[PDB]
Design a binder for these strands. Structure first.
Ligand SMILES: [Ca+2]
Length: 579
DNA sequence: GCGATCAGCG
DNA sequence: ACGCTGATCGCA
């Protein structure tokens, strides 16, 4: 019902200087995954190509890599990375329908061409799930069915670029797509493909010691419980703590007793066992997520792990990282932080280099709120998290432990993002009256922040959405809900999304500027990871001293705010040492 | 499959 | 009853 040429070879008219291009990769994780078919729609017609012939045709390969041959796509990073695993470079991507739809409305959850097309009342294309099936029934359909599906996705991309660009422009988001999100997409593709090398010998050695410690702690739990049970069975763990041992019930879940860490540490005065349960869980998390789980995704021949950075997922414009998630490797407890010793440079005589923004969101907040006291504080390079800890624990700066500071950091963001006296009291284990008084005092010193919180909520009610500094957008229909609890969650999104999203806009622009600078200086240094406000590179040790001056300066100059940006940086032989 | 839990980011 | 995530596990 859609006409296309099922082509046995590549012809010249498939190689126009503008085209919609589909390079179909069905597996969720696209690293080293099969390319099942290719579709091209342009001024001369619609074409399906089998990958075994198109990708071995030198004229098609050259066309893929020629940046002056413009291609419109859906999820170009997926295609570019899968093409890299075939040793083929993809250049010239000038429109990405996934990123366009994510910018117009991140809450759509647009995950295939059909869902984006529906935004514009275009429905001549099927959802990928209807074509490939789900779960165990998932499969590549017969070639005629496959070819028509890829042609229809291309034809839709061809038709939808113009109406998506028009709405992007009306939102002031067209340059956010063309100059920020699409250039970043190519950079993430390089980072994912390069991967991160892993010391599997050290990881496996840590894993075997972990298992020994796990058994020990597990046994002392049974002998403290008087009996044996399944320390991961909530019904059984609840029965031990809150029936057998008769500990107080501080919190319930939808299903029964709560046993979260916060609860367990309030019960620590009552019984020895709760601290052992915490230690047991922590060691168990290292074992299953960070030892076993990481070894499961190491590519064995290279010892590299290849994450996927999802760039059209979070509602605030942050990236997220999957399989493995390399944005939540342990760091806060010393036993957990040791995991980062297994992350090593991919060449001999190279080093890991990490640079991170200092108090990024509070600096964004001071700029956006134009709070005089908060702006003066960062003009002075004060550490607000340390000063707040000094205040909270009545200590001197000399005596601020990394953990009191991590705790104070949660108070600082909690207050600006809407924590209640009740919630602050539970976090600090203080009186609820004290908690309210402290919050009131905090807004006395920063009345511009209080004003900003009120104004941004009112602006979300009037406009229906909030925006970031680079015009990322988030719709908030619930902000006018008649239900109090639904409205409240929405008001706290209005307070938080412009701040966290603007901080995401800044690190994204820093990544684009850093890549261009590394290329200008003809250095081998390249990005490996982003962790929200931190960038991790590797480079020859010969380049470290230049990177100590180049990387902070690029990051600090990515944007100009009413306060300076500050970057801390470290390097060393493993990711552990780059801190 | 989902909710509780915990690892990270602010 | 601060916000944004992803992986694992048991299943009241
Ligand atoms: Ca930081």
């Amino acid at each position: 019902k859609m006409a296309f040429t099922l082509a046995d070879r590549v012809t010249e008219e498939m190689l126009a200087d503008k085209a919609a291009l589909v390079v179909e990769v069905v597996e969720e994780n696209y690293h080293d995954a099969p390319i099942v078919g290719i579709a091209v729609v342009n001024e001369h017609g619609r074409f399906f190509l089998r990958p075994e012939t198109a990708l071995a045709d030198p004229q098609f390969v050259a066309w893929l890599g020629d940046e002056t041959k413009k291609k419109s796509m859906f999820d170009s990073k997926r295609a570019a990375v899968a093409l890299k695993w075939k040793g083929i470079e993809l250049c010239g991507v000038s429109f990405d329908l996934l990123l366009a739809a994510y910018l117009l409305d991140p809450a759509q959850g647009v995950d295939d061409v059909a869902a984006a097309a529906k935004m514009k009342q275009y429905e001549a294309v099927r959802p990928d799930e209807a074509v490939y099936g789900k779960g165990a029934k998932r499969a590549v359909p017969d070639e005629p069915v496959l070819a028509e599906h890829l042609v229809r996705k291309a034809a839709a991309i061809w038709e939808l670029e113009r109406p998506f660009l028009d709405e992007l422009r009306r939102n002031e988001q067209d340059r956010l797509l063309v100059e920020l999100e699409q250039p970043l997409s190519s950079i993430l593709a390089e980072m994912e493909f390069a991967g991160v090398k892993v010391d599997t010998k050290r990881l496996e050695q840590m894993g075997k010691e972990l298992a020994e410690q796990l058994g020990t702690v597990e046994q002392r739990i049974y002998e403290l419980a008087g009996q044996e049970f399944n320390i991961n069975s909530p019904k059984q763990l609840g029965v031990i703590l809150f029936e057998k041992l008769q500990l107080p019930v501080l919190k319930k879940t939808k299903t029964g007793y709560s046993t979260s860490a916060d609860v367990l540490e309030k019960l620590a005065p009552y019984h020895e066992i709760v601290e052992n349960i915490l230690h047991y869980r922590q060691l168990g998390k290292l074992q299953s997520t960070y030892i076993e789980g990481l070894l499961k995704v190491v590519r064995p021949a290279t010892k590299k792990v290849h994450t996927i950075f999802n760039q059209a997922l979070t509602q605030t414009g942050r990236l997220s990282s999957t399989e493995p998630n390399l944005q939540n490797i342990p760091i806060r407890l010393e036993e957990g932080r040791k995991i980062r010793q297994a992350f090593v440079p991919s060449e001999s005589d190279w080093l890991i280099f990490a640079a991170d923004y200092s108090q990024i969101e509070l600096r964004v907040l001071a700029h956006i709120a134009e709070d005089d006291n908060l702006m003066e504080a960062f003009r002075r390079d004060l550490d607000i998290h340390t000063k707040t800890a000094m205040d909270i624990f009545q200590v001197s700066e000399d005596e601020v432990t990394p953990n009191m500071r991590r705790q104070a950091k949660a108070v600082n963001f909690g207050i600006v993002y809407g924590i209640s006296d009740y919630g602050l009291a539970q976090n600090l284990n203080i009186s609820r009256k004290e908690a309210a008084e402290f919050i009131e005092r905090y807004f006395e010193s920063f009345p511009g922040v209080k004003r900003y919180m009120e104004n941004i909520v009112q602006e979300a009610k009037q406009k229906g959405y909030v925006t970031t500094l680079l015009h990322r957008r988030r719709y908030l229909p619930d902000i006018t809900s008649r239900n109090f609890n639904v409205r409240s969650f929405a008001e706290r999104m209005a307070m938080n999304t412009p701040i966290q999203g603007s901080a995401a806009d800044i690190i994204k622009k820093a990544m684009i500027d850093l890549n261009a600078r590394l290329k200008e200086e003809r250095l081998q240094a390249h990005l490996l990871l982003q962790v929200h406000d931190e960038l991790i590179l590797e480079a020859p040790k010969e380049e470290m001293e230049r990177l100590c001056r180049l990387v902070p300066e690029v990051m600090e100059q990515a944007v100009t705010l009413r306060v300076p940006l500050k970057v801390d940086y470290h390097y060393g032989s493993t990711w552990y040492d780059a801190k």
